[PDB]
Amino acid sequence: SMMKWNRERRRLQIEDFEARIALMPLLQAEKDRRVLQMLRENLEEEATVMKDVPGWKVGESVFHTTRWVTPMMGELYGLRASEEVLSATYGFIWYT
Amino acid sequence: GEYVVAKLDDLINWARRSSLWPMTFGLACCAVEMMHMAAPRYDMDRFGVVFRASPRQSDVMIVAGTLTNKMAPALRKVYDQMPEPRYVVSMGSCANGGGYYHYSYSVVRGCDRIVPVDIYVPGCPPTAEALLYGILQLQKKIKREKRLRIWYRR
Amino acid sequence: MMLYIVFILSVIFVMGFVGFSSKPSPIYGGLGLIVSGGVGCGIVLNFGGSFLGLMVFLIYLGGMMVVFGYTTAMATEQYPEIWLSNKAVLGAFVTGLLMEFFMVYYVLKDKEVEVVFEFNGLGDWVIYDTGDSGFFSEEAMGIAALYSYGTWLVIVTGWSLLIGVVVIMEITRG
Amino acid sequence: PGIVELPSLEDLKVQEVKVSSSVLKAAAHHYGAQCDKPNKEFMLCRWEEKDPRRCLEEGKLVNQCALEFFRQIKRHCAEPFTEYWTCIDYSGLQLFRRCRKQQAQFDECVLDKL
Amino acid sequence: MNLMLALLTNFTLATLLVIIAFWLPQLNVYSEKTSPYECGFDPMGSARLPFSMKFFLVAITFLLFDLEIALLLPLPWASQTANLNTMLTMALFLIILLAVSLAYEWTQKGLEWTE
Amino acid sequence: MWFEVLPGIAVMGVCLFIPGMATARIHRFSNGGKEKRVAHYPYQWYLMERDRRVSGVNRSYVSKGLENID
Amino acid sequence: PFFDVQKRLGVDLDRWMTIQSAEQPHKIPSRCHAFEKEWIECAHGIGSIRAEKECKIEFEDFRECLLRQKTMKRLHAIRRQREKLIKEGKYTPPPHH
Amino acid sequence: MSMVYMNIMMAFTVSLVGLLMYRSHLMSSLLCLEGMMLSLFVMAALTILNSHFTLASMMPIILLVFAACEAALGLSLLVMVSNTYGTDYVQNLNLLQ
Amino acid sequence: MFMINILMLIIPILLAVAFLTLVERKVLGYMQLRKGPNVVGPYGLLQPIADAIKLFIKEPLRPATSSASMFILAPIMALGLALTMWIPLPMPYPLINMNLGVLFMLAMSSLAVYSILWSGWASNSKYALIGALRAVAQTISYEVTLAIILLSVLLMSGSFTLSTLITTQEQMWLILPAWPLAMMWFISTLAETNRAPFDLTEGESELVSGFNVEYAAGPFALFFMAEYANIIMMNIFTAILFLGTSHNPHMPELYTINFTIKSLLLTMSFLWIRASYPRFRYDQLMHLLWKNFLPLTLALCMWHVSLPILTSGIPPQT
Amino acid sequence: YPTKETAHWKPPPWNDVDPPKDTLVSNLTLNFGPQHPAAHGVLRLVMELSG
Amino acid sequence: AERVAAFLKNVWAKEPVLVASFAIAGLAVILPTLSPYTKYSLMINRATPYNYPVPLRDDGNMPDVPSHPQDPQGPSLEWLKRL
Numbered sequence A: 001s002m003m004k005w006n007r008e009r010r011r012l013q014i015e016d017f018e019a020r021i022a023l024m025p026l027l028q029a030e031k032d033r034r035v036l037q038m039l040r041e042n043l044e045e046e047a048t049v050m051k052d053v054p055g056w057k058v059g060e061s062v063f064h065t066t067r068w069v070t071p072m073m074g075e076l077y078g079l080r081a082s083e084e085v086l087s088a089t090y091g092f093i094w095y096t
Numbered sequence B: 001g002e003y004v005v006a007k008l009d010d011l012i013n014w015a016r017r018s019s020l021w022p023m024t025f026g027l028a029c030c031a032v033e034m035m036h037m038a039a040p041r042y043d044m045d046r047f048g049v050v051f052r053a054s055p056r057q058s059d060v061m062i063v064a065g066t067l068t069n070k071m072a073p074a075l076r077k078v079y080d081q082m083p084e085p086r087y088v089v090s091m092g093s094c095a096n097g098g099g100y101y102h103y104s105y106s107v108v109r110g111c112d113r114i115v116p117v118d119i120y121v122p123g124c125p126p127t128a129e130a131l132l133y134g135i136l137q138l139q140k141k142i143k144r145e146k147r148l149r150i151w152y153r154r
Numbered sequence C: 001m002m003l004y005i006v007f008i009l010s011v012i013f014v015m016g017f018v019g020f021s022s023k024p025s026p027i028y029g030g031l032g033l034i035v036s037g038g039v040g041c042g043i044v045l046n047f048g049g050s051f052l053g054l055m056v057f058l059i060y061l062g063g064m065m066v067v068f069g070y071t072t073a074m075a076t077e078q079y080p081e082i083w084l085s086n087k088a089v090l091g092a093f094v095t096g097l098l099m100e101f102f103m104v105y106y107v108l109k110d111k112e113v114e115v116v117f118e119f120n121g122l123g124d125w126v127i128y129d130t131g132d133s134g135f136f137s138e139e140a141m142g143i144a145a146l147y148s149y150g151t152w153l154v155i156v157t158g159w160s161l162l163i164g165v166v167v168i169m170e171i172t173r174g
Numbered sequence D: 001p002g003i004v005e006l007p008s009l010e011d012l013k014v015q016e017v018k019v020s021s022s023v024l025k026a027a028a029h030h031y032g033a034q035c036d037k038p039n040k041e042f043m044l045c046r047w048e049e050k051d052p053r054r055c056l057e058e059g060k061l062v063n064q065c066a067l068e069f070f071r072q073i074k075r076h077c078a079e080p081f082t083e084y085w086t087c088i089d090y091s092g093l094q095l096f097r098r099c100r101k102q103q104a105q106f107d108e109c110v111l112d113k114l
Numbered sequence E: 001m002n003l004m005l006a007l008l009t010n011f012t013l014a015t016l017l018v019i020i021a022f023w024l025p026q027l028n029v030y031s032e033k034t035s036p037y038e039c040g041f042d043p044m045g046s047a048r049l050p051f052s053m054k055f056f057l058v059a060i061t062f063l064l065f066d067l068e069i070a071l072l073l074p075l076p077w078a079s080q081t082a083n084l085n086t087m088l089t090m091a092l093f094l095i096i097l098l099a100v101s102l103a104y105e106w107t108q109k110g111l112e113w114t115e
Numbered sequence F: 001m002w003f004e005v006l007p008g009i010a011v012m013g014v015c016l017f018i019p020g021m022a023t024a025r026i027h028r029f030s031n032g033g034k035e036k037r038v039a040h041y042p043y044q045w046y047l048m049e050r051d052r053r054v055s056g057v058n059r060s061y062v063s064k065g066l067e068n069i070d
Numbered sequence G: 001p002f003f004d005v006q007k008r009l010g011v012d013l014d015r016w017m018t019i020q021s022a023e024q025p026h027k028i029p030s031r032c033h034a035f036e037k038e039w040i041e042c043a044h045g046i047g048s049i050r051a052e053k054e055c056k057i058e059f060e061d062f063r064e065c066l067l068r069q070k071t072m073k074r075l076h077a078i079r080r081q082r083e084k085l086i087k088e089g090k091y092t093p094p095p096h097h
Numbered sequence H: 001m002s003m004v005y006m007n008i009m010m011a012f013t014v015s016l017v018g019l020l021m022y023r024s025h026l027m028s029s030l031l032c033l034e035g036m037m038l039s040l041f042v043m044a045a046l047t048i049l050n051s052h053f054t055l056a057s058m059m060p061i062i063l064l065v066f067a068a069c070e071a072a073l074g075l076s077l078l079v080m081v082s083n084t085y086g087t088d089y090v091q092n093l094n095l096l097q
Numbered sequence I: 001m002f003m004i005n006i007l008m009l010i011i012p013i014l015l016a017v018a019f020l021t022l023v024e025r026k027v028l029g030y031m032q033l034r035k036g037p038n039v040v041g042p043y044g045l046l047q048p049i050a051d052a053i054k055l056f057i058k059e060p061l062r063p064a065t066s067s068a069s070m071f072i073l074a075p076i077m078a079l080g081l082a083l084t085m086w087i088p089l090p091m092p093y094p095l096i097n098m099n100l101g102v103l104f105m106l107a108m109s110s111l112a113v114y115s116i117l118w119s120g121w122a123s124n125s126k127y128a129l130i131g132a133l134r135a136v137a138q139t140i141s142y143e144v145t146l147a148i149i150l151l152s153v154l155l156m157s158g159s160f161t162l163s164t165l166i167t168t169q170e171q172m173w174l175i176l177p178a179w180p181l182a183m184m185w186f187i188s189t190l191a192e193t194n195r196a197p198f199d200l201t202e203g204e205s206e207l208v209s210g211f212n213v214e215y216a217a218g219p220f221a222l223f224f225m226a227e228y229a230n231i232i233m234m235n236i237f238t239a240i241l242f243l244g245t246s247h248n249p250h251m252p253e254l255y256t257i258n259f260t261i262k263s264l265l266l267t268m269s270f271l272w273i274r275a276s277y278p279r280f281r282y283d284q285l286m287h288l289l290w291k292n293f294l295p296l297t298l299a300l301c302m303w304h305v306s307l308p309i310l311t312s313g314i315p316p317q318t
Numbered sequence J: 001y002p003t004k005e006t007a008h009w010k011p012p013p014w015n016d017v018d019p020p021k022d023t024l025v026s027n028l029t030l031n032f033g034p035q036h037p038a039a040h041g042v043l044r045l046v047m048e049l050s051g
Numbered sequence K: 001a002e003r004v005a006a007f008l009k010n011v012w013a014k015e016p017v018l019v020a021s022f023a024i025a026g027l028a029v030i031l032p033t034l035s036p037y038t039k040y041s042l043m044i045n046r047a048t049p050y051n052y053p054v055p056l057r058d059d060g061n062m063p064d065v066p067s068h069p070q071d072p073q074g075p076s077l078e079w080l081k082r083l
C-alpha cells in the first residue's frame, strides 16, 4: 500500500511542479520590472539626498565590470520602511 | 470584607482538607493497619488522601507505631522538613502515650513530647476504620480553620 | 529593532561565551555553552539554515549532557564556583562583558565600528539575497548531496567515527 | 566605475495581470500550452542575455499574451473557471487533488468552446 | 514572530506561576525546615563530593553515536537524488560501520558497567 | 464501577479537543474563511507576497479573479 | 596537492567542493557565480605571480561580491546624509520610500 | 564586514583566550575547545548560507562530526587523568618537567 | 487573533493535565480493585482543582544548601518546554507550521532533560543528585535509538513536516508497514517521559522522590504538570506518527475527534502499563536499548532506506 | 648543569612507571531510611556507594 | 550445511534479537540488486522537474527536440502514468 500511494504522490508532485513551470515566465517578467522600478525609484531619491555632497556621483557602480549584477537587500530596499524591509528579509523565514 | 474572607477560608480550607497527603512514614504494628486503610476495602485515595514519600510533598504525618529514643530525633527532623500548614495524627497507644512500652527505658512516652499532635486515634492498633475516622476528624478540624477571618480582624 | 534580530542574538552569543570562557564550575560553563548553542542555532536559522541550526543545538545538547555527568564524577569540588564567587572568574567575566558592551555601543552609535578590523553596523539584513522562488530548501539539497557527491567525505568520516570507538576503548583500558 | 543604466519608468510600465496565485495555478496547465511561444522566447532571452534590462520588450509580450489568455476564459468559461480556482483557493497548499470535480467542468468547457 | 511570541508566552506563564507560588503562601522559615533532606538523619558529607560514573565508556560512545544521526538525518532528502546507485551504497556503508563499531564495543565488553 | 471513570475521561477528552478546533476556526476567521496558506518553500512565499500586492488591501488572503482582468 | 594522486589516477575525491562555480545539485548557482568564473578564467594557466597583477580587476570585483564592503560603505554614506537632511527639515521622503 | 561577523569573531577570540588561560579544572578547558568549534560552525554556516554555495552546506555538519571525536577523545583522557590523581586538576600533570 | 490562539492551546493543556491526574488515579484504582477519587466532587471531578489550590497555597521551601538561581530556573524550564512541545502539533492544523517540526521536538526534548539535571543538582542533596544522574543515564539509553526510529518512519513520509505524516497515512496507518518500529517507539516514549516501568529519576521506592525530592508546593506542581503534559504530547505524537487520521479540509473537527480518541487511548495505555509491571533497574534500561533496540533499529534503518528504492516507492519532498 | 630551581629534581623512574598515589578514593555515604519507603520506616541502613 | 544449522538454531534460541537484525540487514543489502522496480526509482527522481526547462535556440537541425510541450518529440511519462 505504501508503494502505490507514494507513486501517486510522486505523480501529483510532478503535476504541481509543472504548474509552477508554466507560470515562471510570467512571474519572471513581473520580477524584472519590479526590481528595475525599485532601483529607478532608489536612484531618483539618491539624486536629491546627495545633491550637496561634493564628491558624490549619483548611481555609480562599485564594480569595474559593466555586467548586470543582482542587487542585494540593502541596495533594493535601502531607502524604505522598516516593515517593508523586514518582510522582504525575514518574511519567509519567520512565516510560522 | 467579612463576607469575602469568610468565603476565602471556605475555599482554602476545602482545598487543604480535600487534598491531604500523608508522609510515607510508619513505625511498627500500627503501620500495618495504615496499609489496610490504603487497601481496597477502605481506599483512602478515594477521599483524596495520597501517600508521598518526601516530607516536602506531605501535609500530614501519621505517627503509626512506637517512638523510641533512638528514633525521636529523626521523627522531629522529617516533621520540621514538612512545609506548612502541616498536621500530625497520633495513631495507636504507643504513639499516644507510650502504651505497652510506656515504662521502658528506650521509649518516648507519647509522640506529643516531640511534635504537636492534632488528632489522637486510640487502639492497639486502631482498626483501619478507626484510623479512617481519625483522618476524617482531622478533615473536619481543617474545615473549621479561621485563618483569614482572624487576619481580617487583626 | 526587529531588523536587528541576528545582531541581538549574536550579542547573547558572545555573552554565553564569556560565561564559560571565564571558567566557573563546569556545571555553569555547560549552561553558558547551552545558551550559546541556542542563540547560535537562532543565528544560523535566520540565514536560511533551519537544519544546520537545529542540529548544532541538538548535538551540543547531548554533549553537555555527557559533560554534566562527567562534572559530577571528576570536576566537582565542595564549593562549585559561580561567576560571583571568584575574583579571577568575576574579573574575566566582567572584562568580557565590558569589552562586549563597548563594541555594541560604538557600532550602534555610528552604524560602523572598528575593532581591529572594520565592521559595518547597518544591520545584517542588507547583505541578504533579493530574489528567490525555487520550490525547495537550498541547505537541504546541499546537505543531501553528501551521499551522492560526498562519497569520499562519507568514507573518511565513517572511518574516523569507527576508529574513535576503538581508540577511546584503548585509552580508557588502564 | 560607471553609472548603472536603468530604464525609464515609462519603459517599464505595462498592463498587469492582477489576479491571485490560485487563479494562475488553476489556469497554469492550459496557460502553459496556449502562451508557450511568447513565454519560451522570453525565457530564452533571459538565460542568454543574463540581463533583465535587455529582455524588457519580450517581457511585455509575455503579459500581453497572458491577458489575451485570461480574456478568452472570461468570454466563454467565466463561471466554470470561477468555481474551480475558488476550490483551489480554499486549500492551504492549493492542491489539485482536492478539486478534481471542478477541474473537469472547467476542462470540458474550454474543450467545447475554445 | 509567531514562534517568538509563542515561546515568550510559555515561559512567561511558567514564571508567573512560580512568582505566585512564592508570594501567595504564608511562610515560616527556620533552619531545621530548610536543612538538607536525608531520611531523618543529618547528611554524612557534602552532596558535592564526586559521584563515580560506571557507564562512563557508554557515555563517551554516545557522543560518537549521537553524531551518526546528523549524518543519517539527511537521508529522506538524499533519496530524491538522481544518483541512487551511489546513495544507497553510501547510506548502507555508514550504517554498517556504525553497526560494526557497536559490535566491537559489545564484543570487547565496553557496554558492561564497571563495578 | 468502572464506568465511573468515564466522566473524568470525557472532561479530559473535551479539553484536548479544544486546541485543534480553536486553531482550525481561528485560521479560517483570520484568512477570509479559508485554510491558512502554507508556505514551506520560497516559491510559495513569493506567490503569497504577490497576492498581497495584487489584493490592493495588503492582504494575501483577499483573492482577485476574472473581474480584475479588464 | 603535495602529491597529485587525484590527477594521476583520474579519481575526483574533493575537487568538486573547491569552488562555487562548479556543478551544484539541481544547478543552483551561487550568488557570486559570474564573478568567480571570470576570475578563474582570467587567471587560468598563467600562475599566481602573474595573476596577482593581471587579474586584479576580476579579483577586486569578485571580492566586492563576496563581502560587499564597497556597497555597504556607499549605503552608509547615503543613509547618513538622509539623516542629516531629514533631521534639518531639508528633505522629505516620498510616500513609497 | 557585516556586523554579525564582529560578534562571531569576538566569540572565537573569547574562547581562544579562554582555552589559553587555564585555571585548575581540565574540564573547564575542554569546554573552551567546544566553544571554539561552536563559533567556527556558526561563522562557517553564515558564510556558506549567505553566499548560496550549496555543496558546502554539508561542511558545517562534517565540522561537528570531528568536533565530537575531539570531545570524546578529550573526555577519555580526562577519565584517565582523574583515575590517577583523583581530580582533573591540570597542576597534577607536571611529572615531565 | 494569534494571542487568543496561544491561550486556546495552553489553557486547555493545563486543564487536560489536571484531569489526567484524576483519570490516572481512577484507572489505577479500578485495576487495583478499588475506586480512586470519588468524594471531592461527583466522581472525583473536583479533585484536581483541590490538589492544584492546595499546592499553590502550600509553603515553598528553598533548601539551605541549594543553588538558588538554578533551583528556581529548573521548574520554569520544565513547564515552559513542555508547553513548547505542542506548538508544532497538527491537530490537524499546527499553531506553528515548521518545515522541521520533527527535529524541533527532538531538540526541545533534549533541552527538557536539563530541567531534571539542574533541579537535582541545584538541590544539593544526595537523593536529588542520584536521581539527576539517572536522568543522564536514561537519556544516553534512548536518545540514539529514538532519533533513528523516527528516521526510518520519515523515509516513508519523505519530509520532516508533521503535517506530511497526515498525508502519508491517508490510505493506511503507518503502523501496518512499521509495527516493529512502532513497538520500539512506544517503549522509547515511556523511557523518554520517565514513565513506569522506566520511572527511574524519581523512583519512589529507591530514592524517596529522586530529582525533585526537595521541591514543595508550587515549584513541585510545575514539575508534575510538565510530566503529565509530556505524557499526553508524546502520545499525540505517537498517534500522528503511526495512526494517521484522515483530514477533511471542509470538516476539520472530524479529524480532531478521531485524533483525540486515539491520543486518549494511547495515554490510557500508559496508565495501564504503570499498573502492570515492576520497575526496571536503570542499567538494565541501558542494555535493553543498546543491546536490543539499537541493533534492530540500525537494521530496520537500512531496510527502510532500501525498501522505497527497491519497490520504487520513494515519497515526494512535498 | 645544576641550578637552584632544579635542586628538587630526581631522575625519572627506570621503567617510566611512577608509584600509584596512596590517596584513598572516598565513597559516598548515604542514610537509607528510617523515613524511606523501602526501609520499613525504622531501618537506618548506612551504605557506602561507588556510583 | 549441518554445522551452520546447529549454530543458526543455537542463536535463534539465545539471541533471537540479533538473528532478526542480521537477517533484515542482509535483506536491505541484497534485494535492491534483485528487484525489477529499482530502475524506476531513479527514473521517477529524474522525471521530477525542480528547475525551469530552459528552451534551446532552434538552429534548424534539431529533429528530436519539440517545438511545443504537447508535440510528440521529447521524453514521455507514459510509463509513470501506469506505474
Ligand SMILES: CCCCCCCCCCCCCCCCCC(=O)OC[C@H](COP(=O)([O-])OCC[N+](C)(C)C)OC(=O)CCCCCCCCCCCCCCCCC
Pocket (backbone or CB within 6 Å): B008, B011, B012, B147, B148, B150, B151, B154, E019, E020, E023, E024, E025, E026, I052, I053, I056, I057
Ligand atoms: C494552577 C494554578 C492554581 C493557582 C491557585 C492559586 C490559589 C487560588 C486561591 C486563592 C485564595 C486565597 C489564598 C489565600 C492564602 C494565603 C495564605 C494564608 O493562608 O496565610 C494566612 C495569612 C494570615 O496570616 P496572619 O496575619 O493571620 O498571621 C501570620 C503570622 N502568624 C504566623 C504568626 C500567625 O493570610 C494573609 O496574610 C493575607 C491573606 C491574603 C488573601 C488574599 C490573597 C492576597 C495575597 C497577595 C500577596 C501579596 C503578593 C502577591 C502574590 C500574588 C497573588 C496573586
Ligand SMILES: CCCCCCCCCCCCO[C@@H]1O[C@H](CO)[C@@H](O[C@H]2O[C@H](CO)[C@@H](O)[C@H](O)[C@H]2O)[C@H](O)[C@H]1O
Pocket (backbone or CB within 6 Å): C117, C118, G069, H001, H009, H010, H013, H016
Ligand atoms: C589569534 C586571534 C584570532 C582572532 C581572529 C579575529 C577575526 C580576524 C578577521 C580577519 C579578517 C580581517 O580582514 C582584514 O581587515 C580588512 C578586511 O576587509 C582588510 O582591509 C584592508 O585590506 C583590503 C585589501 O584589499 C582593503 O580593503 C584595504 O587594503 C584595507 O581596507 C584587511 O586587509 C584584512 O586583513
Ligand SMILES: CCCCCCCCCCCCO[C@@H]1O[C@H](CO)[C@@H](O[C@H]2O[C@H](CO)[C@@H](O)[C@H](O)[C@H]2O)[C@H](O)[C@H]1O
Pocket (backbone or CB within 6 Å): E084, E085, E086, E088, E089, E092, E093, E096, I309, K029, K032, K033, K034, K038, K039, K040, K041, K042, K043
Ligand atoms: C565494510 C564496508 C561495507 C560496505 C557495504 C556496502 C553495501 C552496498 C550494497 C549495494 C547497495 C546498492 O546496490 C545497488 O543499488 C542500485 C539502486 O540504487 C541498483 O541499481 C538499479 O537501480 C538504479 C536506480 O535505482 C538504476 O539506475 C539501475 O539501472 C539499476 O541497476 C543496483 O542494481 C544495486 O546493486
Ligand SMILES: CCCCCCCCCCCCO[C@@H]1O[C@H](CO)[C@@H](O[C@H]2O[C@H](CO)[C@@H](O)[C@H](O)[C@H]2O)[C@H](O)[C@H]1O
Pocket (backbone or CB within 6 Å): E095, E096, E099, E100, E102, E103, E104, E106, E107, E108, E109, I291, I295, I296, I298, I299, K015, K018, K021, K022, K025
Ligand atoms: C547492520 C545492523 C544490524 C547488525 C547487528 C549489529 C550489532 C551486532 C552486535 C554484536 C553481536 C555479536 O557480539 C556480541 O558479543 C558478546 C560478547 O560479549 C556476545 O556474548 C555476550 O552477550 C550476551 C548479552 O550481552 C550475554 O548474555 C553473554 O553472556 C555474553 O557472552 C553476544 O552474544 C554477541 O551478540
Ligand code: SF4
Pocket (backbone or CB within 6 Å): B028, B029, B030, B031, B064, B065, B066, B091, B092, B093, B094, B095, B099, B100, B123, B124, B125, B126
Ligand atoms: S499501639 Fe499497639 S499495634 Fe500500634 S505499634 Fe504499639 S503495640 Fe503495635
